[PDB]
């Protein structure tokens, strides 16, 4: 998902 | 420990600083006229909504007004989710619980918590865009044909209410954290991790409103209602949201935002 993605860049 | 979380109070609201480009300490000062920054473009009719489209400025590029609105608000909450992010992400314990735990408590977390920070900017007269650039009259949002002028008008409603109780931005730094930090989202895997972490964070607010706020013994019991209270708020959105899709012929919505509707209520 977009939203995991976010969370996952430092 | 007292101290420890004292230090966590510090700690958010440095990371708070840090997330959101505008304070609501800057926007007060914007709002009442003290700052020597420039003044925000004044839009309060069609003509003046026009001639802002040079004055103020967009981070994102875009190369009927009702609509336009609309979409203005829909970026504005994109990049709301982003910022938003970063400082879940600066809780502590968040970035260790399971991944898609992190994905739901933001999910149904976001909104409740733009909605917060949005009261902020608002006054009874309107509300600050575009970091200040900008302030758009609560009397010209109404105005707009249906259903959108009443797209905006229950968060002023909430914002005249929440910004009476004239919390600051080290009170909001917590306030926004507990709510991040919801054990009771649908869907969530592993409650327990995030229910000891609310607790904790409570805690945290209970005292800084007990340290900041010593006349006002009523505080924290009134914004834990005010909690509840947004979640309606959320629900309303989504509903009339739901109205406009249809009543409308179809507009593009971003997927960002797509995403966290699908199953939002
Ligand atoms: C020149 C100009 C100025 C403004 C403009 O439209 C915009 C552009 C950004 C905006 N930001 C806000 C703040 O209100 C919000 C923000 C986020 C969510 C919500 C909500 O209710 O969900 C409301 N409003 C009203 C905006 C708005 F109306 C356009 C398109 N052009």
Request: a positive charge; glycine letters at 6%; zero cysteines.
């Given at each position: 998902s977009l939203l995991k993605k976010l969370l996952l860049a430092p | 420990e007292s101290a420890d979380l004292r230090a966590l109070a510090k700690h958010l609201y440095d990371s708070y600083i840090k997330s959101f480009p505008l304070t609501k300490a800057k926007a007060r000062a914007i709002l009442?006229?003290?700052?020597?920054?420039?003044?925000?473009?004044?839009?309060?009719d069609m003509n003046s909504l026009m001639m802002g489209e040079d004055k103020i400025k967009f981070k994102h590029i875009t190369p009927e007004v009702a609509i336009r609105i609309f979409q203005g608000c829909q970026f504005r909450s994109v990049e709301a989710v982003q910022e938003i992010t970063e400082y879940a992400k600066s809780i502590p314990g968040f970035v260790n619980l399971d991944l898609n735990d992190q994905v739901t408590l933001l999910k149904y977390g976001v909104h409740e918590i733009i909605y917060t920070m949005?009261?902020?900017?608002?006054?009874?007269?309107?509300?600050?865009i575009s970091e200040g650039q900008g302030f758009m009259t609560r009397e010209f949002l109404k105005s707009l044909r249906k259903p959108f002028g009443d797209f905006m008008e229950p968060k002023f409603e909430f914002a005249v209410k929440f910004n009476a109780l004239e919390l600051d931005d080290s009170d909001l730094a917590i306030f926004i954290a507990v709510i991040i930090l919801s054990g009771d989202r649908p869907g969530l895997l592993n409650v327990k991790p995030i229910e000891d972490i609310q607790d904790n964070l409570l805690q945290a607010l209970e005292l800084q409103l007990k340290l900041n706020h010593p006349e006002?013994?009523?505080?924290?019991?009134?914004?834990?209602?005010?909690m509840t209270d947004l979640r309606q708020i959320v629900t309303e959105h989504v509903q009339l949201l739901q109205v406009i899709k249809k009543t409308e012929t179809d507009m593009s919505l971003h997927p960002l935002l797509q995403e966290i509707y699908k199953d939002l209520y």
């Open positions: - | 009442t006229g003290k700052t020597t920054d420039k003044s925000p473009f004044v839009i309060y949005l009261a902020s900017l608002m006054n009874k007269d309107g509300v600050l006002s013994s009523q505080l924290f019991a009134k914004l834990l209602q005010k």
